[PDB]
Structure formats: structure tokens, C-alpha cells
């Protein structure tokens, strides 16, 4: 109901009507990236400079109807002045902390299921067992190794169709996945995330990260296993070796 209604409201005004009519689907990306905002050259300097202002961050308009304009002593939490090239409003950082102490609460039980990679890292490290540190010269030789320890033996494009069919089943188009490994992955990640309401985009991004294999060139000495490379900073050094066995093994 609503969606077509703001569609009609947009088409009511002449300029947006022209934008909707003359613009083709292919140009979607271009106009979406059409912005006057330059990409910052020195982000640290301005982040240290903007945070000294009042209302340094930006938030959706809806914040004006969930968080009061001021806190107990009267420190303002949000302003009604919109951003430069968006309908979002500039708000103070307190509106963040406020949201974490009296804002609406939900059931975050499914975030562990979504962010599978990070929670698997935590579980692997929690059950790890350290050993003695041995001091001897390490011959670090540079090798190509896979960093992602949960890659399902799929490439970027190869798993992209799987991700769409898992999250966006209707926009798949011609592709119907042939490999049965992809079939089982789709089934599992479909039944597992059937009602998760985090965001389609973040779900797709994390599925891409988990399933897609990624490789990088690093100086290693021993190890060479996927689980042993994520902790390469902790097990191998310039003149010391720290024996380690992740919780998985």
C-alpha cells in the first residue's frame, strides 16, 4: 500500500516525475552515486575536529519521534536541521548513548547466527590452548595463503548467485544453481535466516564473506592452515614462536 503511495506522491511533483520517466534502469547506479560530497582526504583530522561540535553525526528523520529533543538536564540530543544533500537530520553523539540506555530493545539472539564468521573466531579462540614460547630465529618466507577459514569452496561470482537466491529469491533471473553443494548451502542458510530482520544488504555481505574464498600473500613460518593464519600475529614473531592450537582442533 504505502510504497506505491509515495510513488504516486513523487510522480505528483513535476521534477521527480521527469526524473522517474526519463531515467532508465541502467543509470540507476549513476544517479544513486550522484553527489556533491567529496571523499575525505584526511578523515582523522576532521573526525577529531567535527566531534568537538554539537550535532556532529547524522541520523534518519525517525529519530525525532523516538528520542526526546533533550535529556534530563537539557542537553540537546538531536536537531531538526537536515543534512546537506539528504533528508537525514544532524544529531549529537549523546543520542547514541541515550539509545543504549533507554532506547527500544529487541531480541538479538539471531545476530550470532548472522555474523557467523566473527562468532566462530571467538569460539575458536575461547577454547584454544597456549604453550611455551620458544626463542629462536624464525625464517619467515612469503607465501600465498587463504585467510578466510569458513570459505565453502566458492568464488565471488560463484557464491553471488547463491547469496541472491538465499536473500533475494525473486531477482535471481535466469540462473538456477546446478551444483548440489550450492543447493545444500541455500537450503541451510534459507531455513536458518528465514525471519531475520537485520538487513538484506548486511546479510548478503556477510554471506559473501563467509562462503567466498579469499587469498592474500603473507610472510609465514610454519602453520599454513586457515585456522592457524588468523592468529599468525600471535603465534609467529621475529625471534619467538608461540605454540597454539585453536579450539576447533
Amino acid at each position: 500500500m504505502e510504497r506505491i503511495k509515495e510513488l504516486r506522491d513523487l510522480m505528483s511533483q513535476s521534477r521527480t516525475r521527469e526524473i522517474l520517466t526519463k531515467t532508465t534502469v541502467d543509470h540507476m547506479a549513476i544517479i544513486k552515486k550522484y553527489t556533491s560530497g567529496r571523499q575525505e582526504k584526511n578523515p582523522a583530522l576532521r573526525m577529531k575536529w567535527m566531534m568537538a561540535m554539537k550535532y556532529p553525526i547524522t541520523a534518519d528523520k525517525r529519530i525525532m519521534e523516538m528520542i526526546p529533543e533533550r535529556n534530563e538536564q537539557g542537553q540537546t540530543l538531536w536537531s531538526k536541521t537536515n543534512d546537506a544533500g539528504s533528508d537525514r537530520v544532524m544529531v549529537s553523539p549523546l543520542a547514541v548513548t541515550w539509545w543504549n540506555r533507554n532506547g527500544p530493545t529487541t531480541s538479538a539472539v539471531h545476530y550470532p547466527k548472522i555474523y557467523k564468521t566473527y562468532f566462530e573466531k571467538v569460539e575458536r579462540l575461547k577454547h584454544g590452548t597456549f604453550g611455551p614460547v620458544h626463542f629462536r630465529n624464525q625464517v619467515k618466507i612469503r607465501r600465498r595463503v587463504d585467510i578466510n577459514p569458513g570459505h565453502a569452496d566458492l568464488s565471488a561470482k560463484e557464491a553471488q548467485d547463491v547469496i541472491m537466491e538465499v536473500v533475494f529469491p525473486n531477482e535471481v533471473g535466469a540462473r538456477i544453481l546446478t551444483s548440489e553443494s550450492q543447493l545444500t548451502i541455500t537450503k541451510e542458510k534459507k531455513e536458518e535466516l528465514q525471519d531475520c530482520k537485520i538487513s538484506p544488504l548486511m546479510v548478503a555481505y556477510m554471506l559473501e564473506r563467509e562462503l567466498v574464498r579469499k587469498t592474500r600473500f603473507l610472510p609465514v613460518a610454519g602453520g599454513t592452515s586457515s585456522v592457524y593464519i588468523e592468529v599468525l600475529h600471535l603465534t609467529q614473531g621475529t625471534c619467538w614462536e608461540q605454540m597454539y592450537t585453536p579450539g576447533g582442533e
Partner: peptide, 14 residues
């Protein structure tokens, strides 16, 4: 610390 590590790579001990 780089000095210390380089010297300790010679004698197998911190």
C-alpha cells in the same frame, strides 16, 4: 624492542 629481539635471536632466550 627490535634491538632486543634481534639480539635474542642469536642467544635462544629472552
Amino acid at each position: 624492542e627490535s634491538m632486543i629481539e634481534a639480539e635474542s635471536s642469536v642467544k635462544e632466550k629472552d
